[PDB]
Amino acid sequence: RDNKQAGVFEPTIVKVKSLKFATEAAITILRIDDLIKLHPE
Amino acid sequence: GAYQDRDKPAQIRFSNISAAKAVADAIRTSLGPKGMDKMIQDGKGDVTITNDGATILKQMQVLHPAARMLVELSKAQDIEAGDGTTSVVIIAGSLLDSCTKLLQKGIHPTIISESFQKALEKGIEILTDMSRPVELSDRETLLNSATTSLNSKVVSQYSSLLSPMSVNAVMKVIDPATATSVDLRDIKIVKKLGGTIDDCELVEGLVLTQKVSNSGITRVEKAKIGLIQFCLSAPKTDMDNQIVVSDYAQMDRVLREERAYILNLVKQIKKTGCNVLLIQKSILRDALSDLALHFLNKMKIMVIKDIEREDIEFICKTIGTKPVAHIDQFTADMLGSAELAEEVNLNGSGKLLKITGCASPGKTVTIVVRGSNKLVIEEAERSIHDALCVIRCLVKKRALIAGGGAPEIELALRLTEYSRTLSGMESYCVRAFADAMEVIPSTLAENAGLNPISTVTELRNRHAQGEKTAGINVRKGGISNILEELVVQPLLVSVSALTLATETVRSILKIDDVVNTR
After folding, report:
1. Enzyme group, top EC level (chain B)?
2. Is B41 within 8 Å of chain A by CB?
3. Which residue segments constitute the domains of chain B, with CATH numbers given?
4. Residue B55 near residue B48 (C-beta atoms within 8 A)
């Protein structure tokens, strides 16, 4: 349909900040290539 | 001939070498423009991301002592340079590998150490020869050095904006003339969760993580700042004291009179003309009393509690305001002034203090760090600190080297020809030394996904007349003149790396056996 006519709207900052944070998360996690575990004290 | 009776020393040497080499190869991945970071989960339950080697090794709880010496090495390099910690540890690994080769190559370790000393002397001479003197005043070369160090950690994401950040900060904190070793602790780092790393900001001023205590005052203009140490509460002596009540007017005389005392305090404070109050911790005794807060808010004075004693020197350096510890000394002479000071609102409701613009320009400076993940913020601050460190290193020695392993292959070539010239088993030693230096370009090619051996060999062949300007390029995926790709690191970095590694390898060779203790 046309959400503009339907009134289905979202605030811009939602999608903007969402995509930005998602990109940062992807950058952080993707750069991983090894975990090293330590059983506790 | 002479007979070697024992074999325990040789075996323990071998064990140490294998451990060191394994640690080196473990670090080997995280390196260079193509570097890949690691993550360590603490047994406590903490999690960290890191690409810098020193933090990696400090998070390591290494068992075998040799690698603990390696960790210590990395710590020293970081407290000297900031990157190349990866480089210096990888050199250590390669050196010890060639040391193995020389051990089954039957040569006694002491001769190895002496030959290594000759080798490092030749190397330091060559490295000093190859550099390019560079004045501190040229911003763009500084910027190139920055972006060289930066595009190896995660923050290469916003490298383009982070590099001017760091360089401007350092220029504002240095004396551009004395060429001293301007301290990094004069730079304030703020880990503030939320936001975007892009939104990292410089504040030519002062930032306090604490929050306001006045309900009603948020922004103040033309504010005059004053920092006060003596508490604002009922007077409580150093030695034990107590009011005695035995009589009639004692009650109201008390109440009225602590009110009057606090009133005198606040009234003098205003009479100085101040409008923004700073109060340090006084955990030993009473802090700022509530009643005094009431007066101050009534008189419309910006107020802050809980200033850490370690921050006081930084604050007075920055805003240019000597503290006051008694009423009388508090005078309009000492009240500092700043163009603006107020409480910003980020994090939705995570509120922060900024004081921008000061007529008395303190040499110090602060950094605000933004970003989504806590871990990525910590890594970003690590990388920025490394950037400041490398700039300081450049300040220490106004010499510049193109990075990209080209210095190292230069070293390998010159040292190999030097070994060919110099006779004796030390010749074999030095040849091993050059083959050891050969590793860094190999790792660069490997993390670059290029054929390592072919690339290294061709790069040596080029470099036979293709001096240090040429080297391994990431962006083109081949070999070119790196200097024109503007990827340069200060001489001190690799110099310190080589020196530290050489001393540590000599020391390791001195070792023969490990004795368990009580």
Report:
1. hydrolase
2. yes
3. 9-134+399-518 (1.10.560.10), 135-201+364-398 (no CATH), 202-363 (3.50.7.10)
4. yes
